[PDB]
Design a protein around this ligand. Structure first.
Ligand SMILES: *[C@@H]1O[C@H](CO)[C@@H](O[C@@H]2O[C@H](CO)[C@@H](O)[C@H](O)[C@H]2NC(C)=O)[C@H](O)[C@H]1NC(C)=O
Ligand SMILES: *[C@@H]1O[C@H](CO)[C@@H](O[C@@H]2O[C@H](CO)[C@@H](O)[C@H](O)[C@H]2NC(C)=O)[C@H](O)[C@H]1NC(C)=O
Lengths: 50, 50
C-alpha cells in the first residue's frame, strides 16, 4: 500500500487481525507497522490554497 | 387516509352585523432563513490526479 503522508503515533487500539484504517470517506488514515506491532496515523501532507 | 385541509369554519355573514375584537394577543413567531453555506474549495488537479 503506497502513498504520501505524515506517519504519527496513534491512539487507536486495533484488533490483532486488522492492518489498515479508514475514515468515513474510505481513505486510509491508519496503518499497522509490519516490523513492530504498532499503530500509526497517516495525516495527509500539508496542502492549501496560496 | 384522505387528508383534511382544515377545520370547517362557516363565518356568520349577514348584511348588517360586524364582529369587533374586544381583546388582543401579543404573539411572537419564529422564522428561520438560511443565509450562507460552508465555503468549500476543491483543488481540481489534486482531486483528479493527486
Ligand atoms: C354572532 O351571531 C351569529 C349568529 O347568531 C353566531 O353564529 C352562530 O354561532 C353558534 C355558536 O356556536 C353556532 O352554533 C351557529 O352555527 C352559528 N351560526 C352561523 C350562521 O355561523 C356567531 O357565533 C356570533 N358571534 C359572536 C362572536 O358572538
Ligand atoms: C384580555 O385577555 C387577557 C389575557 O391575555 C386578560 O388577562 C387575564 O385576566 C385574568 C383576569 O383578570 C387573569 O386571571 C389572567 O392572568 C390575565 N392574563 C394575563 C396574561 O395577564 C384580560 O383580562 C382580558 N381583558 C378583557 C377585557 O377581556
Amino acid at each position: 500500500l503506497t502513498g504520501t503522508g505524515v506517519l504519527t503515533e496513534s491512539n487507536k487500539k486495533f484488533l490483532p487481525f486488522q492492518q489498515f484504517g479508514r475514515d468515513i470517506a474510505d481513505t486510509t488514515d491508519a496503518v499497522r507497522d509490519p516490523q513492530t506491532l504498532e499503530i500509526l496515523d497517516i495525516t495527509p501532507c500539508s496542502f492549501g490554497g496560496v | 387516509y384522505t387528508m383534511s385541509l382544515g377545520a370547517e369554519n362557516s363565518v356568520a355573514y349577514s348584511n348588517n352585523s360586524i364582529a369587533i375584537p374586544t381583546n388582543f394577543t401579543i404573539s411572537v413567531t419564529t422564522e428561520i432563513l438560511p443565509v450562507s453555506m460552508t465555503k468549500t474549495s476543491v483543488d481540481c488537479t489534486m482531486y483528479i490526479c493527486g
